[PDB]
Amino acid sequence: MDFLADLMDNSELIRNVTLCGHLHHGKTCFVDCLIEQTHPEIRKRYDQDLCYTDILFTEQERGVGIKSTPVTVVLPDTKGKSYLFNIMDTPGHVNFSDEVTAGLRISDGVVLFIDAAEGVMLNTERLIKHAVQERLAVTVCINKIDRLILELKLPPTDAYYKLRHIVDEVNGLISMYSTDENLILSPLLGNVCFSSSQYSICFTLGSFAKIYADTFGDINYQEFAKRLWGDIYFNPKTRKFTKKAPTSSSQRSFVEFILEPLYKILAQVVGDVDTSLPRTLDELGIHLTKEELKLNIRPLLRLVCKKFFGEFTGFVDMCVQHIPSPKVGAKPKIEHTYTGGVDSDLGEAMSDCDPDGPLMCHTTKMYSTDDGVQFHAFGRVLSGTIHAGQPVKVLGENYTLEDEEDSQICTVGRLWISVARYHIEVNRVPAGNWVLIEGVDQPIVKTATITEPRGNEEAQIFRPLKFNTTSVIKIAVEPVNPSELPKMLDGLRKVNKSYPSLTTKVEESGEHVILGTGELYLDCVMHDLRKMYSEIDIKVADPVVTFCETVVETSSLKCFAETPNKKNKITMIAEPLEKGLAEDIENEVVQITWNRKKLGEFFQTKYDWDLLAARSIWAFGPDATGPNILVDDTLPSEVDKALLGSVKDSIVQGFQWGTREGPLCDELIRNVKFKILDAVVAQEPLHRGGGQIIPTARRVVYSAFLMATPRLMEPYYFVEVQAPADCVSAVYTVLARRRGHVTQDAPIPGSPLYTIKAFIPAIDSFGFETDLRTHTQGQAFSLSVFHHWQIVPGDPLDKSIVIRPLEPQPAPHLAREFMIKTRRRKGLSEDVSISK
Amino acid sequence: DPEEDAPVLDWFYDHQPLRDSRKYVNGSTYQRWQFTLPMMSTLYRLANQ
RNA sequence: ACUCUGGUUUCUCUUCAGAUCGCAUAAAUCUUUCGCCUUUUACUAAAGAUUUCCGUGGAGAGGAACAACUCUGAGUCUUAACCCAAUUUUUUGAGGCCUUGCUUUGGCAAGGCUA
RNA sequence: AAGGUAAGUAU
16 A cells, blocks of 8 residues: 555545445445455455445445445556545435535545436436536446346347437536536546446446457557447448448447447356357457356356456546546635635645645544544645644634634544545645544534644635535434433534534524434434434434425515614515525525625616615625525615614624524524615614614514515425336325325336426425335335425414314414424414514 | 256156256255256246246 | 376265354243233243254365366467568667867767768 | 042952
C-alpha cells in the first residue's frame, strides 16, 4: 500500500467518485467486483453475494444499502497506468438520499448506475437532478446487462434498442436539468459503461476494442471504439463501416461486434457447458481447469467473464477521461460550495489544491466506532495536509467572521484511509483526498469545516448540505424507564450525528421528536438508537407528518399591533402568494442577495408585479429561502422611509420568527405574502429596540395570518410502483383507500412490468408499501419521496367539528382534527383564539 | 417419451440410478453426482407438479 | 513440441468438526414460566442448559480392487518456404579537422570548420 | 399403563 500512499501526493492521479443510482442496481456489487479485482484474498462466495461495503448488520439483514461506504483503491486503466480512486458507495433507496448528498459534496464526478432490465427509475432521475445541480460530472454505467440475455431473452438488436433508449432518456433528463451542451452522455464519447456486476462484466467501447486489439492485433482500439455504436453498419466486403446497411439483415456495429459475442458467450455456458463450451473457450483463448469446469452455471459465468474481460478498465477510463481530478475540479467545487467563493484569497488558494498550504478540510459524514462511543469525521481535504497529533480549528455550521464562537480547537488523533471493512492508518493526508479523522467528534454535528488553529482568520465555512428531500415524517420517542432519559438524549445526539438529514427537536411539552424521510429511514434510525448508542428500551409513538399553514384569502381586517411602551404601531395584512412563487423562492431561483433592480424586473416580467410593489420586498420566508414574502407597502408620503428603516432588521427578524412558528400550530408558515400598510416608528432609539419591535412584529404577523382565511398544508408523497400488468388494479385499489390518485400508469419499454406514478398523502402513506406488496403477493414494489405540500381539506378553525377518539374523520373534518391533535401533542392550548 | 425424455429414459425408475456410471457418480458409495444440463432440464420438466 | 511428475474406486480404523456437520429434523433429562391439576407413568407450550439417537464433513492410518493406465503442473513450452525497416540494437547517410580551457603527461571539457 | 391383589387352610 506504499504505492497507494505515494499516489495520494499527486492530485492529478486521484479520482473522487460517487456511485449513485436507484435501489438495488448493482452499485455495491460493482464495488465488490473492484475489491475482488484489487484484493486477491477476498473472493465472492459461489451462491451468497459478497457485500463488502455493506458493513452494517442492518444493511446485511435488510439487504438494502443504508449508509455511504467510502472505498479507496488503486485501479489501473486500459493503458496500465494505475490511479487512486476514492469511491463512495451511496445507498440507492430514496429514503436515504441524505447519504448521497453527503457523498456528492466531497466528490468531483458521478457514476450513475442503471439497471438494464429496468428503465430510468425514480431515484435515478432524482440523483441525476441532484448531481447536475451540484455541478458534478455525470457518467452512466448501465449495469445488469446479463438480465437482457439470461432473463429477458431479448434478441441482440432489441438489447441494443433498450440500451439506446436508456441512454436517450438519461440524455433528455440531463438536458432538461442542465444547460451545458457538453453534458451529452454516449458510449462513443466514453461516458457510458455497460456492465454486469453479478457476472463481473464491465466494458466500454474502448476496452472491448482493446480486447480485439490484444487478440487480433493491428487495430487502433481508440479509433475502433468510435465505430462500435450507433447506426454505423459494418460492410464485410469493403471492411469499412458505413451509416447505411450493406445488406437487408445487416446488424449494427455494436450488435455485430459486442452484443453478438456477449450473447454467444453467455449462451454457450448456461446451456452448452457440457458440449461445445471447451471449444468456445479455446476460441476465446480462455483456459479453465478441470475443477473449474465443474462449477455451477452462475459461478462459471462469473469465472468465464473474469477471464475474458479481465480487469475493470472501461470504468476507469470513464472516470479518468470524464471525471475531473481534484486539481481540475477544485474551482467549480469552491465556486459552488464555499461561502466566500473563489474570489477570496483562500478561494484562490483552494483552486490550487496544494498539498502544502492552508489546511481546510470539509467533512460531510460521521462514522461511529464499534462501541458507538466515538465518531470519526469523514471528508475531503481541499487544501493543505492534515497530520496526526496536529491541533486544528474545527469550524461549525453557524460560524461566521463576526461571532467565531461555533468553532473549537481540537487535536487530530489517528488518521485513516477508509476502505469499507479495513482502514489504512496514515500519518498525513495531502489535499484532494478523503480521510477518516478522530479526536474531532465533539464539535462536529452534521457538516463541518476544519482549518489550522492559528494563522487563518479569513477562513469561512462551506455551505451546509442542501438535501434533495425534506424530512416530514415525525415520531415521538420516550424511554420505558423515565430515569434513563439522559441515555436516550445521548442516543438522540448520536443518531443526529450519524444521520445527515435527521432532525431531533424537543417540543414545548417535553416530547422528543425525530424527523425522517420514510418508514425505512425511521425504522433504521430507531433500530440504531435502541441497539447501539442509548442501549436502553425506548417507546415510539405512532408516526405523524409535519404540517404547514397557509392562507387562501386576503385578510379582511387591517391587523395592528403595538409595543409594550405603545410608542410603535405596525399595521400588516396577509394574502396568499402567486402560484409557483413559493416553489421558485425555495428552489433558490431568486435570492435575498439579488439587487433590487433585477428582483423587481423578475417579479414584473414573470409575475406581473407592479414596479413600486416589486422593489419594496424586504425579506423572504422564515429563512433565506423560506416560502414567504414580506413587502413594505407603506406609502412614502405617509411614513418616513429612513425612520422606518431604523427598525427594518428587528421587524424582519420578528417576521421570520412568526413564519417559523405559526399561529395555528408550532409549524412553518408557507405561501403567505405579508404587506406592511402603516408603521408608526418612534424616533428615540431606546424605545425602538429589538426586544420591543420583534415581539410586536411576531404578534402582528400572527394577527394578519389568523384574520386571513387559514388552511393546513400537508406533505404529499410521489410514488413510483413497479408492478406487472395484472397488479395495476390492486395498486389502484390500495391507493384509493389512502386518498391517493394516480397520475400515470405507463408500461416500461423493454420489460413486461408497468410503472404507476401516483400522489399519496404522507400521513396516509404509513404501511403503504407493506399493503401494496401484500395485496400483490410481493409483485408490486414502491418507493415514496416527498414532492409537494397540499392544503388539507376542511376548515381548521371550524369549532363546530366534533372529533371522535379512535375513528378516522371524514374529509371536511380532516383539517380540524389535524390541528387539534397537533396542538395536543405539541403541548399548546386546546384551540387558538383569533384574538391572540 | 423416447424423444424428449432420452437424457433420463434409460436409467430412470431404477434403484439408485447411474450407480455404476462413473461419469455421473463418484462410485458405488453413491455420494456425489455430476449431471449434464439436458438431464437436469428433463428432470426439471418431469417434476413440475 | 520436448522431460519429469504417479492416480481412482472400495472396505475398515483413529481423531477433529468451525460450517444450514443435516438446504433435513427426533427423543430424553434438568431448571424456570405456564396449561391440566388428583397421585405415578404419560403430558400441555414457551424459554434456557444438557444427553442420547438417525445421519455428515475434513484429516490421519491400515487393507482391497483396475494396477497399471493416463493426467495436471513444472522444466524453457526447441523448426525451414517467399516477403522488411527513420524512434532503442546485422544494411542505417553519426565522418574528420581545429580552437581554447584543463589533466603531472596521456586525455577530458566546450566551441568552430564541414561535404 | 396403573393408583381395582382379601389374608388363608386343604386337595
